[PDB]
Design a binder for this molecule. Structure first.
Ligand code: IYG
Ligand code: IYG
Ligand code: CU
Ligand code: CU
Ligand code: NI
Length: 310
């Protein structure tokens, strides 16, 4: 997107609001499939709320973008190749923009809490450059995301419940390998409103469910090879203390001559189901994670859609 120049990245909106533009510093991708990252310290130290996001991406080159909040970006640079790392600490994903799947807006009254004593101090943007035909000009790119911040406390706080595998091993040639994840929910109620799935090339399908009284309620189901944007949930789903969140990624070993385990490269795999939710401000926590399988046997009753591609 157009580089800002002399006006800088901060646009005052009114007494308590401002837009912060998070753009690449005029970079020029040299290889296709390049992944660039950069970070912006928040301008204010006190707590603020991110209530909106507007993509500022060049359609001819940018394939996808992801925006995280964290306290220690992986590089002190102007920008860097993300394969070096995103954040030293555990990054919280806030937004994903996919070229072929237009992002959905946050419900009004819902905001991510950042800054202050416990909120993220930085935003780290990762841009994935696919086609670079437009880059023979050796033109620089300032694609990114604009974020709307406010000091006004929001009634509903947005958070992320991340379900991910750590132990998965996919034997070469192996027709079907399931990665099951399950945890019991023990916090105040959350209402899922969006979900994103993430797998590398071996993933066939990823599904997540809320299981209450043995009954399975679909949160989201998606083919991880389709654009990995946050998609709105079919129907609002609350998860309450006692419920169990269960997820399954279906992989294959077909095509691999060696075993594939969980990891950060293209030769590795990942099984992630991001569940974006909102909670009443007075009960809210911004992030939860599940990296276990507490009810392995429970999957004997998983809906068949969980094994059939989409
Ligand atoms: C090892 C793995 O599966 N990593 C995933 C999930 C992940 C993401 C964030 I944000 C975290 O803070 C943590 I802890 C783990 C991963 O990096 N996925 C990237 C993606 O979703 O595209
Ligand atoms: C005064 C105000 O809030 N104006 C905009 C907010 C805004 C402005 C810019 I410049 C941004 O880049 C972003 I992110 C958000 C407003 O009312 N936007 C409505 C909307 O499109 O959602
Ligand atoms: Cu991409
Ligand atoms: Cu990955
Ligand atoms: Ni409800």
């Amino acid at each position: 997107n157009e580089c800002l120049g002399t006006i800088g990245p901060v646009t005052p909106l009114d007494a308590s609001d401002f837009a912060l533009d998070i753009r690449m510093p005029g970079v020029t991708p040299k290889e296709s499939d390049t992944y660039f990252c950069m970070s912006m310290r928040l301008p204010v130290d006190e707590e603020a709320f991110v209530i909106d996001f507007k993509p500022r991406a060049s359609m001819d080159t940018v394939h996808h973008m992801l925006l995280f909040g964290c306290n220690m970006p992986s590089s002190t640079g102007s920008y860097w190749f993300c394969d070096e790392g995103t954040c030293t600490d555990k990054a919280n994903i806030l937004y994903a923009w996919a070229r072929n799947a237009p992002p959905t807006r946050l419900p009004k009254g819902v905001g991510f809490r950042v800054g202050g004593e416990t909120g993220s101090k930085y935003f780290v943007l990762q841009v994935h450059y696919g086609d670079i035909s437009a880059f023979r000009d050796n033109h620089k790119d300032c694609s990114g995301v604009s974020v709307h911040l406010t000091r006004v406390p929001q009634p509903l706080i947005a958070g992320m419940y991340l379900m991910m595998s750590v132990d998965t091993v996919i034997p070469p040639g192996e027709k079907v390998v399931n990665a099951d994840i399950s945890c019991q929910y023990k916090m105040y109620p959350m209402h899922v409103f969006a979900y994103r799935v993430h797998t590398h090339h071996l993933g066939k399908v990823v599904s997540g469910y809320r299981v209450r009284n043995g009954q399975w309620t679909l949160i989201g189901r998606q083919n991880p090879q389709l654009p990995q944007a946050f998609y709105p949930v079919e129907h609002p789903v609350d998860v309450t203390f006692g419920d169990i969140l269960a997820a399954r990624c279906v992989f294959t070993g077909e095509g691999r001559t060696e075993a594939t385990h969980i990891g950060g490269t293209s030769s590795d795999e990942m099984c992630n189901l991001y569940i974006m939710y909102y909670m009443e401000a007075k009960y809210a926590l911004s992030f939860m994670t599940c990296t276990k399988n507490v009810a392995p046997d429970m999957f004997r009753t998983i809906p068949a859609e969980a094994n059939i591609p989409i």
